[PDB]
Design a binder for this molecule. Structure first.
Ligand SMILES: Nc1nc(Nc2ccc3c(c2)CC[C@@H](N2CCCC2)CC3)nn1-c1cc2c(nn1)-c1ccccc1CCC2
Length: 274
């Protein structure tokens, strides 16, 4: 169940981007904090498009997952607002935004150790979800948010969080699903309504490819029908320029779901790169 926040307390500011049938804006929330102190807190405001209110339940059940669980690497949900005849989620605002944008923007300044650390944090987050038998279903660099930059003076590493998954792939139309190849695994392309836990292991491999490819989008040059043919012909992604994680990527992107390794095994593999 969602803590109610008032339109009177929420201020809408600039657009921050788009998701599937959603728009996000930076916001300000007036609230009473610890010790009764008044705070105007930066917040993320996610709005389901009016033309697609049909997806409100999945849109809201997506965020509910992230409230029933608490973990250092999972975005917080503050609640919802009846901010007009409109369905709106109020969430944690992450200073430095999406990882895919950050990778592009700072490809020259990011080394393999920075990439390895972020991969470990994502894997730890996914391990937590696996242990709870929860399927995220939308793991991608765009949904990974940078809380904190590396501090080269002190050697302090970056810190990331995984956002909520958004509208489930089990209800999205096929044209959107195909656009999301190769994040959407092949077994979900042939039947979206049979999502298994193994889904996130495949998408984790794809996201790992983004991390090693400095923000590039794998298979962006292929249209939807060619992305389908990519799966039909059982192709694998090419080794990213930084080929350190190529074998882990292809091991996670296994066309047999049951053969994809546990996230415990993935973490030990990431640790064993030392
Ligand atoms: N929680 C959450 N904080 C935030 N801060 C955020 C958003 C945009 C920016 C920045 C921060 C940083 C500033 C700018 N430059 C300049 C310097 C650094 C980078 C970039 C702009 N973004 N963000 C989120 C983001 C998403 C979903 N959810 N949340 C999301 C989750 C599930 C489904 C769909 C979506 C919608 C899209 C992705």
């Amino acid at each position: 169940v969602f803590h109610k926040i008032r339109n009177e307390d929420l201020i809408f500011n600039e657009s921050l981007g788009q998701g599937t049938f959603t728009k996000i804006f930076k916001g300000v929330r007036r609230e009473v904090g610890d010790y009764g102190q008044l705070h105007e807190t930066e917040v993320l405001l996610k709005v389901l498009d009016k033309a697609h209110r049909n997806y409100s339940e999945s849109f809201f059940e997506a965020a509910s997952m992230m409230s029933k669980l608490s973990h250092k690497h999972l975005v917080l949900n503050y609640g919802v607002c009846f901010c007009g005849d409109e369905n709106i989620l109020v969430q944690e605002f992450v200073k430095f935004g999406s990882l895919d944008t950050y990778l592009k923007k700072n490809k020259n300044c990011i080394n393999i150790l920075w990439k390895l650390e972020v991969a470990k944090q994502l894997a730890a987050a996914m391990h937590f979800l696996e242990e709870n038998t929860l399927i995220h279903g939308n793991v991608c660099a765009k949904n990974i948010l940078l809380i904190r930059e590396e501090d080269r003076k002190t050697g302090n590493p970056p810190f990331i969080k995984l956002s909520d998954p958004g509208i489930s792939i089990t209800v999205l139309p096929k044209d959107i699903l195909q656009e999301r190849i190769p994040w959407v695994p092949p077994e979900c392309i042939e039947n979206p309504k049979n999502l298994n836990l193994a889904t996130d292991k495949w998408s984790f491999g794809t996201t790992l490819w983004e991390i090693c490819s400095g923000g590039d989008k794998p298979l962006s040059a292929l249209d939807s029908q060619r992305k389908l043919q990519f799966y039909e012909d059982r192709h694998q992604l090419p080794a990213p320029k930084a080929a350190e994680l190529a074998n882990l990527i292809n091991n996670c992107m296994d066309y047999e779901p049951d053969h994809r390794p546990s996230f415990r095994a993935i973490i030990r593999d990431l640790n064993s790169l030392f």
